[PDB]
């Protein structure tokens, strides 16, 4: 588990030197980025159950073969495990947004997931579709452009951070495929 700080430190350890100027300058841009990252994680957390509900329900409604008898969503217990997994994926993405580095997302959840969904017979393209729906919904919450919720924040540009969160969801969706 490594944040931004630990990434700078471990890279400087492989380089075998002290920390220096430019790396600390980029990390100063991280700390000044600061409350935008805080409020961003607050936006993705305080809507998260609803994101998971809408995303998995959208996954089923796009592809109705999941709910067809014999599909991997066809049962209550399969559906419960489905909702549970979508909740976990959004949880580790939120951890990767607090840390600023995807080492937590790589070590906790992404490691050994493709072989797991291969082992269970979970269709991978449907999972990548659900991850993509969580991506678009999550960036729509992070720009405060949701069509059902518009909460008050002071104005500021947040393109970079949205590209960061989209990079984590593309890491997950690229990882299951």
């Amino acid at each position: 588990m490594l944040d931004a700080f630990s990434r700078v430190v471990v890279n400087s350890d492989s380089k075998a030197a002290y920390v220096g100027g430019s790396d600390l300058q980029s990390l100063k841009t991280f700390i000044s980025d600061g409350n935008k990252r805080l409020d961003a994680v607050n936006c993705i957390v305080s809507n998260a159950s609803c994101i998971v509900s809408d995303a998995i329900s959208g996954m089923i409604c796009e592809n109705p073969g999941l709910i067809a008898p014999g599909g991997n969503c066809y049962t209550n217990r399969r559906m419960a495990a489905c909702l549970r997994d979508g909740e976990i994926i959004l949880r580790y993405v939120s951890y990767a947004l607090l840390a600023g580095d995807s080492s937590v997302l790589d070590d906790r959840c992404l490691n050994g997931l493709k072989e797991t969904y291969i082992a269970l017979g979970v269709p991978t393209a449907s999972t990548s579709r659900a991850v993509s729906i969580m991506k678009a919904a999550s960036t729509a919450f992070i720009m405060n452009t949701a069509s059902g919720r518009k909460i008050e924040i002071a104005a500021g540009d947040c393109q970079a951070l949205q590209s960061e969160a989209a990079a984590y969801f593309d890491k997950v969706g690229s990882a299951v495929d």
Binding site: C61, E62, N63, P64, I67
Partner: protein, 86 residues
Amino acid sequence: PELVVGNKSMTVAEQVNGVNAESYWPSSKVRPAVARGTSPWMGLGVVKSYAAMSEAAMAYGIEQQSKPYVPQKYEGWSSGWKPKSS
């Protein structure tokens, strides 16, 4: 209008309470209430709601209960079914 109407002279009591109530007489409505165009910034004075249900909560309830989706007869579920997919 007798040739058109035929036998359907409506009584005064039904015609007042009919569809054309506001157009049968328009005149004698006694003291129409008028709502003034207040600015939302200034509340202008002393008003107590004096209602069982709050003004905000009641407006919320009327807006939630507003218009029921009308189930129609022909989207009704048959024996078997397949759910349509977008």
